[PDB]
Design a protein around this ligand. Structure first.
Ligand SMILES: O=c1ccn([C@@H]2O[C@H](COP(=O)(O)OP(=O)(O)O[C@H]3O[C@H](CO)[C@H](O)[C@H](O)[C@H]3O)[C@@H](O)[C@H]2O)c(=O)[nH]1
Ligand SMILES: O=c1ccn([C@@H]2O[C@H](COP(=O)(O)OP(=O)(O)O)[C@@H](O)[C@H]2O)c(=O)[nH]1
Ligand SMILES: [Ca+2]
Ligand SMILES: [Mn+2]
Lengths: 272, 123
């Protein structure tokens, strides 16, 4: 077989995204017969050059995950991606650390397959247009550019939160993500700062193509706004060399392969 | 209530240029500080910060948790959780005059460049 076309012919464009009707993962599996154990899918039709590991930071968000899988599996297949879904579940009940879990996902996904692209996605964000491709570009990609909670517009030009995608090389280039941001906020700005220091710019689809919905939700206990975030973001240039992939330590407590995803439960320690 | 950049900019027009901080800089600072949420309430190591400006009960407003606060602004912190910004602004100006812009930690890292995106063109 030959290479998949540059743009998939299966795309439908805008989609109605709602979280009213209950989701039954059993149904989801049925509706997605081509997805293999561990939430892996490869085009049988053509050869995709996009080997994508989709990494979701996670803790106590199963209901959101259901909706995420219900909507994304069909979308990702239509995008003709060779992908795998990884939910990185933080064990314990100490402060949440989104970015550290994403680093864990990078390392763990690499043990399964020769991935060349990593999509990092909050568990509650669903794209509204399938032309917003969940893959890597020549520069780091910010995907969730127009969220409904922000009135469908980028909150600030340096915003890199929500859903982003870095090639294996781009991620390695910045020594991955910081492991030192505990609690909510700032870690995405630190990451933006790292990409900028390595001379990269942020690639983004336009606001129409990038429309995204976030399942409405209250704030999680143990992920309160981080008081040190603004001070940390100011020092990214110096700390990125010592805090990242090269300094990541964690313990794997469980690896679960379900038909729709791989869920890795890990102990990533506590604020130090 | 989560306000818009322009709703905020118009409400705080008064503050423009005060102590040398422009409206463009304030629009940026307030977005990162409270997400323009007039009801924002956040803890910061033993104290609590309120509203659009995240004014703290440590020295600036009086909360029930810390009645003995210096309460420099001379106001109940609950007055900082509504949609009437005149008192919030008056308090912020006292912080700016006394402590200065450094009070707002987001200013330096997030609002030192690319200030043009923060402009409100609504007449
Ligand atoms: O208890 C928790 C806390 C967080 N998360 C994961 O962390 C993501 C982000 O947390 P929130 O949804 O509560 O955060 P925000 O909705 O306020 O989202 C934004 O702010 C975060 C700030 O830390 C990130 O930058 C995130 O990428 C960006 O979309 C979640 O979606 C989810 O994937 C969990 O699974 N469980
Ligand atoms: O691809 C999948 C993933 C999950 N599940 C179902 O979802 C449940 C819950 O998984 P979770 O990790 O949230 O619960 P745990 O198994 O750890 O109790 C499973 O037990 C299954 O019944 C499923 O049917 N297909
Ligand atoms: Ca008020
Ligand atoms: Mn969210």
């Amino acid at each position: 077989l030959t290479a998949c076309p540059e743009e998939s012919p299966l795309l439908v464009g805008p989609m109605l995204i709602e979280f009213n009707i209950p989701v039954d993962l059993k149904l989801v599996e049925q509706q997605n017969p081509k997805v293999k154990l561990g939430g892996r899918y490869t085009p049988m039709d053509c050869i995709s050059p996009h080997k994508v590991a989709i990494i979701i930071p996670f803790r106590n968000r199963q209901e959101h995950l259901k909706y995420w899988l219900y909507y994304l599996h069909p979308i990702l297949q239509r995008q003709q991606l060779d992908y795998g879904i990884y939910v990185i579940n933080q064990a314990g009940e100490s402060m949440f650390n989104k970015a550290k879990l994403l680093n864990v996902g990078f390392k763990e996904a690499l043990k399964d397959y020769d991935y060349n692209c990593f999509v990092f996605s909050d568990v509650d964000l669903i794209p509204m247009n399938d032309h917003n491709t969940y893959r890597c570009f020549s520069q780091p990609r910010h995907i969730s550019v127009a969220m409904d909670k922000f009135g469908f517009s980028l909150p600030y030009v340096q915003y890199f939160g929500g859903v982003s995608a870095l090639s294996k090389q781009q991620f390695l280039s910045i020594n991955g993500f910081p492991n030192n941001y505990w609690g909510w906020g700032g870690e995405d700005d630190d990451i933006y700062n790292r990409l900028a220091f390595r001379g990269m710019s942020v690639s983004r689809p336009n606001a129409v193509i990038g429309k995204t919905r976030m399942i409405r939700h209250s704030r999680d206990k143990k992920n309160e706004p981080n008081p040190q975030r603004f001070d940390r973001i100011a020092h990214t240039k110096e700390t990125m060399l010592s805090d990242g992939l090269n300094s990541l330590t964690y313990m794997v407590l469980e690896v679960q392969r379900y038909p729709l995803y791989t869920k890795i439960t890990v102990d990533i320690g506590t604020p130090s | 209530t989560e306000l818009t950049k322009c709703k905020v900019s118009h409400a705080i027009k008064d503050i423009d240029g005060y102590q040398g901080i422009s409206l463009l800089e304030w629009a940026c600072v307030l977005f990162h500080t409270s997400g323009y949420d007039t009801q924002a309430v956040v803890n910061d190591n033993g104290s609590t910060e309120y509203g659009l400006f995240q004014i703290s009960d440590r020295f600036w407003c009086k909360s029930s948790e810390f009645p003995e606060s210096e309460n420099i602004c001379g106001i109940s912190c609950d007055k900082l959780l509504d949609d009437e910004l005149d008192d919030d602004i008056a308090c912020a100006k006292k912080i700016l005059a006394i402590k200065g812009i450094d009070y707002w930690k987001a200013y330096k890292p997030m609002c030192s460049e690319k200030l043009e995106q923060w402009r409100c063109e609504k007449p």
